[PDB]
Design an enzyme around this catalytic site. Structure first.
Site, PDB file in Angstrom:
ATOM      1  N   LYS A 139      26.921 -30.638  -7.443  1.00 23.76           N
ATOM      2  CA  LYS A 139      25.837 -30.703  -6.465  1.00 23.76           C
ATOM      3  C   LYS A 139      25.875 -29.464  -5.565  1.00 23.76           C
ATOM      4  CE  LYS A 139      25.704 -35.741  -6.542  1.00 23.76           C
ATOM      5  NZ  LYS A 139      24.287 -36.032  -6.869  1.00 23.76           N
ATOM      6  N   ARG A 191      24.537 -44.033 -14.409  1.00 28.41           N
ATOM      7  CA  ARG A 191      24.006 -44.765 -15.554  1.00 28.41           C
ATOM      8  C   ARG A 191      25.030 -44.898 -16.676  1.00 28.41           C
ATOM      9  NH1 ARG A 191      19.124 -40.832 -16.906  1.00 28.41           N
ATOM     10  NH2 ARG A 191      19.402 -40.646 -14.620  1.00 28.41           N
TER      11      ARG A 191
HETATM   12  O1  LIG Z   1      18.782 -38.667  -9.597  1.00 31.20           O
HETATM   13  C1  LIG Z   1      19.768 -38.083 -10.033  1.00 31.20           C
HETATM   14  N1  LIG Z   1      21.008 -38.162  -9.546  1.00 31.20           N
HETATM   15  C2  LIG Z   1      21.508 -39.021  -8.478  1.00 31.20           C
HETATM   16  C3  LIG Z   1      23.020 -39.027  -8.694  1.00 31.20           C
HETATM   17  O2  LIG Z   1      23.657 -37.980  -8.513  1.00 31.20           O
HETATM   18  N2  LIG Z   1      23.473 -40.215  -9.185  1.00 31.20           N
HETATM   19  O3  LIG Z   1      24.976 -40.492  -9.454  1.00 31.20           O
HETATM   20  C4  LIG Z   1      21.187 -38.758  -7.146  1.00 31.20           C
HETATM   21  C5  LIG Z   1      21.264 -39.851  -6.283  1.00 31.20           C
HETATM   22  C6  LIG Z   1      20.973 -39.717  -4.933  1.00 31.20           C
HETATM   23  C7  LIG Z   1      20.610 -38.469  -4.445  1.00 31.20           C
HETATM   24  C8  LIG Z   1      20.290 -38.333  -3.097  1.00 31.20           C
HETATM   25  C9  LIG Z   1      19.942 -39.466  -2.369  1.00 31.20           C
HETATM   26  C10 LIG Z   1      19.590 -39.352  -1.031  1.00 31.20           C
HETATM   27  F1  LIG Z   1      19.259 -40.435  -0.313  1.00 31.20           F
HETATM   28  C11 LIG Z   1      19.579 -38.109  -0.420  1.00 31.20           C
HETATM   29  F2  LIG Z   1      19.241 -37.977   0.852  1.00 31.20           F
HETATM   30  C12 LIG Z   1      19.918 -36.979  -1.140  1.00 31.20           C
HETATM   31  F3  LIG Z   1      19.890 -35.782  -0.490  1.00 31.20           F
HETATM   32  C13 LIG Z   1      20.269 -37.081  -2.489  1.00 31.20           C
HETATM   33  C14 LIG Z   1      20.522 -37.372  -5.305  1.00 31.20           C
HETATM   34  C15 LIG Z   1      20.819 -37.506  -6.665  1.00 31.20           C
HETATM   35  C16 LIG Z   1      19.762 -37.298 -11.349  1.00 31.20           C
HETATM   36  C17 LIG Z   1      18.495 -36.580 -11.729  1.00 31.20           C
HETATM   37  C18 LIG Z   1      18.654 -36.255 -13.240  1.00 31.20           C
HETATM   38  C19 LIG Z   1      19.913 -35.382 -13.475  1.00 31.20           C
HETATM   39  C20 LIG Z   1      21.165 -36.049 -12.889  1.00 31.20           C
HETATM   40  C21 LIG Z   1      20.947 -36.364 -11.417  1.00 31.20           C
HETATM   41 ZN   LIG Z   2      25.426 -38.171  -9.748  1.00 31.41          ZN
END
Ligand SMILES: O=C(N[C@@H](C(=O)NO)c1ccc(-c2cc(F)c(F)c(F)c2)cc1)C1CCCCC1
Ligand SMILES: [Zn+2]
Ligand SMILES: O=C(N[C@@H](C(=O)NO)c1ccc(-c2cc(F)c(F)c(F)c2)cc1)C1CCCCC1
Ligand SMILES: O=C(N[C@@H](C(=O)NO)c1ccc(-c2cc(F)c(F)c(F)c2)cc1)C1CCCCC1
Ligand SMILES: [Zn+2]
Ligand SMILES: [Zn+2]
Lengths: 519, 510, 520, 53
Positions: free
Chosen positions: A302, A379
């Site tokens: 990230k 997931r």
């Molecule tokens: O939606 C995604 N990822 C989430 C994640 O990393 N899950 O384990 C993800 C979840 C929450 C955020 C997130 C949520 C918030 F409330 C927020 F303020 C923020 F800056 C990010 C960002 C990404 C995917 C998008 C497709 C590729 C992998 C990451």
């Molecule tokens: Zn993630």
């Protein structure tokens, strides 16, 4: 109960948990308005509106058993104040026994039925009157119409927002923090509302407890220490429990869950709590929470602007909700039901031992998965947890998870999205949303997108290459791991954290608990 | 009006094809019970298998010994029914005539979705594009309801047609074999109308921004209305200034093309029981303005499509004017303009005044669609209609919520939203109800103006845009269809014409 | 003590050159009123022309050779001008019928040369020394310079003349030859003679610091750096103590230890001490940030312009403090006790690293919410400041490559000084003047303190709203000094010389002058 | 730091003097920017409001 590994001896080896909160010392009394209000020590607040008149004048309708206070609160005195939603005022006077008393009101607007969001606004105003005032008692007079669930919601929210979490304060504790010991509530037909008080207090702590786990930082709340907290909770509530370690997870061929945790210094721990009613079991339910205690993204680190890597202790909000539900269910002991509380807990880290973008991994149902982005790890852990859940033989599987950032672009920070393979189950979640007052909205699983998950080499892709609707694509993925059970998926990625207040909401505890109870 | 030109080579009208080869195809629907005649052209069997991707087996009877032998189970077992897989062979029939015979696989699910049916159609059209044929015959060895059957016809017509207007052979007969053929025959010419409203919408959208500008697009709408005998009115800048449509006029300030506001009206014969205003967003090119579309992925080269909503509304006018539903009065509205960078453009931070008196602080000049829609909604509510429905490529956030397949509908009236959802089922254009969350309204509280155009914090842009639009409808049932994700077919590199059939079904079903 | 290795080719020490060619130069100073002897090597005249911009060269000194006096008469020199940094070479025969080389460097028209102008003069002189195999250099000062500027001239000449070939293997300069004799002619020579060996001490302290900085992170890691500091202490007869992890755990340095958690090298806290013989009037702790490599941690330096390949220089502050230790240990001031402190570690990405959002506990009991693992320097300094205050000193000065925001505030020439005490700050400014290492006083703006209010911990490591990071970082460090005069010198912008592609060694002379002036 | 509120000035009203007494004001603290104010009747039965920052 496992030993928490440490890099240095100053590393913490448990989450601090506050069980006996000052809320639990508050004696609550409900009286019927028809008897009139006694106005004595503490602070007495009237909740008042003016239906139809936007910013209309304050008029106090309840009988007050004090000639002095009645005279102070008569219409011509009150008419210079208005009912604007969230406004409040403080009053000072001497009662019929020549004791000074504090009185006030909170404005509740002009609309007859307050929404959950309106009610939160009223509670926040009420709490600012409780902060920075050493009070022994609060009395709240309802001169507005609320049904039973909205009365409970009011109390839950009051309890939750009044509480201040100082577990990580050391040199900076609030010197002036004192809580009331007594809460009086005046309302019409009080006898019908009394049953909500103890339920509210249970719902408050389930929510507060999940909040304490979410807010706890990742060096405190890691896969070992989080599963130890779940063991302790199950011991206090007499729940059955089982923590699966890597060995057992290897034997169960949970390869998608195990690959996510390969890079962590903390071994994977799979939490399995069970509640079973003593009578005849008429419904079996599995609740699955995503339990990623810190999410770096892995090798898909990230690093992009706005990816908010410092928030990512919150990626176990789903597990927290499921455990907070376990507290409410274990405390309230519903009948005729068996509930399994599940979380595949791990940490998503960068290391020589991490799984890699492009790796192909085998989940426990034998499906091979091509990893296209190590940051779509939730997931993967849920895929193995959903296969485990279905082998239990349940009527419903509901998962809750901070799955996709795209939720912030679809429903925002107030409504969670619910997805599913079964309309009956989805309607029950929506019904629970309405009675819990935790808003959720039904979103589609669009089958036309499924083909973007076709992998050239593995059985399925973890992510889509073309589709940007990532919350739907993730639901399409998860659906592949539920063969023949009614299943729903609640994405709380956008609603879990209260950015304005800089704290968790513990969102979902009340929702899942209402879901269990009304079944 | 005269289209202004920078140089003499600048185009001054949108080329339109009204009379298309599709309109020359003679369609005949036959029952399957009688058996199928295989005498000429290409004959395709739509076959499924409820074993996954199992073998092809033909059940219909064919009145030709040679083709029957070709279709015997031992041959067809070499082929499978995986969705969209097809084979076709050329051969001589009983009268020594050359015929082509083939199949398209329809999978293993009994009920085909609109998406599956589209995949079936594309495989059919691929064969059509590669074969010189006089006749196509399709044998339905699957179950489809009347709406799905009409959808098959519209989609086949639409995908078969090739738009050659900017460049420098078709079958003449369609045969259909189907169980209960008589219940399907009325769908045939309705499909032909629905196809053309959709293809006409698509011609306007695909037309680039130098051909399709506010002037030439309002001229195209006039010509359309004259051909359909619809009442028509084009409002110019002078009249728009009189009505004080400052939000809309501000968006167009930096364009060389004057704003043109389109208003067509269809009046039914007989008692008018419902009056509807259909409002289409009509940005003929959206550069972003001073908030220029320079960011990675902002796809400025696509923004000729920002008038997809207007085009859907004019394609609906074609269908409504042609089918002539009764007891309804419909206004087709669009505030057409072009969002450009100029010394005369509106600026980030400008405070503008809408036609109902509300002042608006502009936070981003690329959120121009909601400014033009605001003045269009005030115009529409003054018509005294029962329903206002607007359709618009409004927010890019749709791509992250519902994606490229389903459009979002937001509104202030559950009964109207439910009618749209019902129209989505019968048109087979997919829509999903998304909420207007009131708790986000406070993000539009401007420090200086009555309201902010955009939020500076909330990322749920499609919801915030709906909360802003809702402020310009006081006392009328209103719904808003965001087609930003759904309008363009990125794989096929062409518009979808999305929303014509949805809006027409909404009108026709009352 | 033992440096861990991944493979056997990994280095286990920092190569350090103590006896440099500069140290082999015999330096003589003569009074200019006795006349200049031009016998051998290169003889360079430093010449200005006041008022007249680009004025003609005129050689005012008496030259004790008829042939060279004739060559340099005004008629011959008129075609050359004094534009700052210009230079020329002459070739002629002296009275002994030997060939000699003579020349000049133009010092412009302003009779008072600045720090930067004198750097330009030295760099032109050094161009005449490079690519020319000379046994001797003579410099004739026909310009006015006070004592600190004459010292600065020599220090700078020594530093720039030296070429660091420690890491050259197959590409050493085969033509590298250094002069063995330096002659200097100046007015009132006797008063400048004392500056010569001071300049040599100041040159080596600066150069020693530059050697540590330039050394890459695979050579210069927390273990090899603390090993070198010990070896320096032994050579100087300083008291020394290196604190390892077990002792740091005992001292509860949770902020410092968290930063180093992800590294393969154990944290090492350097503590050197110089104590004057006799009465100790002033006690001083100098604290140097010593991050031997800054990857950013999980807030990885991956953004365009983050220059991760430069981040071996993040121990520049520690190097300045060790260079100051060399100078103080060598010049031995009276009346002072000085502690040379550095909390050395490496900031890496690993399964063991600290995470954004961790809450950690400093040695003064304060809990800290980590908002960005790349603001790691202020964490290590927090615990080092607490350590320094427990020593009971009168002054704490820290020097650190703390914020990249310095490039946008003062840039690459002036360091920023922040502090809680006006008198201490003025002493730093005063030392800036006599060391000629430029420093500008910047405010600690208390209004920003609220943005460090954490919801869960006692304090936030970073601001989420204030973009003035050098000030916010100063406000953070202030929370770890309770009741002691403290100043903070942020050298993040001035430490690396991007044009010459090498460290400056900045801060060594500034700190040494600070210590020396407080002793006098 | 964040100590109790204490009001020194004498006020020429008996009702407000009682409200401002040490025992009442010490339930409040002086953290910068914190405020409270209360509506009350003064000795002349006029409505006034009294508070602190
Ligand atoms: O939606 C995604 N990822 C989430 C994640 O990393 N899950 O384990 C993800 C979840 C929450 C955020 C997130 C949520 C918030 F409330 C927020 F303020 C923020 F800056 C990010 C960002 C990404 C995917 C998008 C497709 C590729 C992998 C990451
Ligand atoms: Zn993630
Ligand atoms: O959603 C926005 N803008 C849309 C617009 O320009 N309206 O006039 C917008 C609409 C469509 C897209 C879009 C749609 C696509 F199908 C697509 F492929 C694409 F690259 C962009 C992007 C932005 C806002 C979001 C709030 C701040 C200003 C920009
Ligand atoms: O100032 C910061 N970081 C510095 C750092 O990493 N300290 O350990 C930082 C220090 C120096 C630089 C830097 C200095 C240079 F001379 C340079 F050329 C460069 F490209 C970067 C960049 C960042 C903050 C900025 C806000 C909080 C995260 C890190
Ligand atoms: Zn735009
Ligand atoms: Zn850093």
């Amino acid at each position: 109960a496992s030993e928490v590994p440490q890099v240095v001896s100053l590393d913490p080896t448990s989450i601090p948990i506050e069980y006996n909160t000052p809320i639990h010392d508050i004696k609550v009394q409900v009286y019927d308005i028809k008897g009139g209000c006694n106005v004595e020590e503490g602070l007495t607040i009237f909740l008042v509106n003016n239906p139809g008149k936007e910013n209309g004048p304050v008029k106090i309708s309840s009988k007050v058993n004090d000639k002095q206070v009645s005279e102070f609160l008569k219409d011509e005195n009150m008419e210079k104040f208005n009912v604007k939603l969230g406004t409040s005022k403080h009053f000072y006077m001497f009662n019929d026994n020549k004791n000074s008393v504090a009185v006030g009101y909170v404005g509740c607007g002009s609309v007859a039925d307050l929404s959950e969001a309106d009610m939160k606004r009223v509670v926040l105003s009420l709490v600012t009157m409780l902060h920075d005032n050493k009070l022994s008692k609060l009395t709240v007079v309802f001169e507005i119409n609320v049904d039973k669930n909205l009365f409970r919601f009011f109390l839950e929210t009051l309890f939750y927002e009044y509480m201040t979490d100082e577990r990580f304060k050391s040199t900076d504790k609030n010197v002036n923090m004192e809580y009331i010991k007594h809460l009086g509530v005046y309302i019409n037909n009080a006898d019908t509302y009394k049953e909500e008080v103890e339920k509210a207090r249970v719902y408050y702590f389930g929510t507060y407890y999940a909040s304490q786990l979410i807010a706890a930082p990742s060096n405190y709340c890691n896969p070992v220490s989080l599963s130890n907290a779940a063991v302790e909770l199950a011991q206090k509530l007499n729940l059955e429990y089982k923590i699966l370690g890597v060995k057992e997870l290897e034997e169960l061929k949970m390869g998608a869950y195990l690959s996510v945790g390969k890079g962590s210094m903390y071994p994977n721990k799979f939490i399995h709590l069970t509640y079973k009613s003593k009578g005849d079991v008429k419904k079996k339910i599995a609740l699955v929470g995503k339990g990623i205690t810190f999410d770096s993204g892995g090798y898909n680190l990230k690093a992009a602007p706005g990816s908010m890597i410092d928030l990512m202790k919150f990626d176990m909000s789903g597990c927290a909700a499921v455990l907070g539900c376990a507290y409410c269910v274990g405390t309230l002991k519903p009948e005729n039901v068996e509930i399994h509380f599940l979380s595949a807990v791990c940490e998503n880290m960068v290391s020589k031992n991490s799984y890699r973008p492009g790796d192909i991994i085998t989940a426990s149902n034998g499906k091979t998965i091509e990893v296209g982005n190590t940051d779509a790890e939730g997931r993967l852990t849920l895929a193995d947890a959903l296969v485990y859940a279905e082998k239990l033989g349940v009527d419903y599987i509901v998962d809750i998870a901070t799955l996709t950032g795209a939720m912030l672009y679809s429903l925002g920070t107030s409504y969670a999205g619910v997805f599913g393979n079964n309309e009956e189950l989805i309607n029950k979640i929506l019904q629970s949303s309405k009675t819990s007052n935790e808003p959720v909205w039904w979103l589609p699983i669009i089958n036309e997108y499924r083909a973007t998950l076709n992998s050239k080499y593995a059985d399925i892709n973890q992510i889509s290459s073309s589709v940007k609707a990532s919350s739907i694509v993730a639901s399409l993925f998860l659906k592949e791991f539920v063969q023949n059970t009614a299943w729903a998926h609640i994405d709380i990625a956008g609603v879990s954290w209260n950015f304005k207040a800089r704290k968790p909401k513990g969102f979902g505890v009340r929702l899942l608990t209402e879901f269990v109870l009304n079944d």
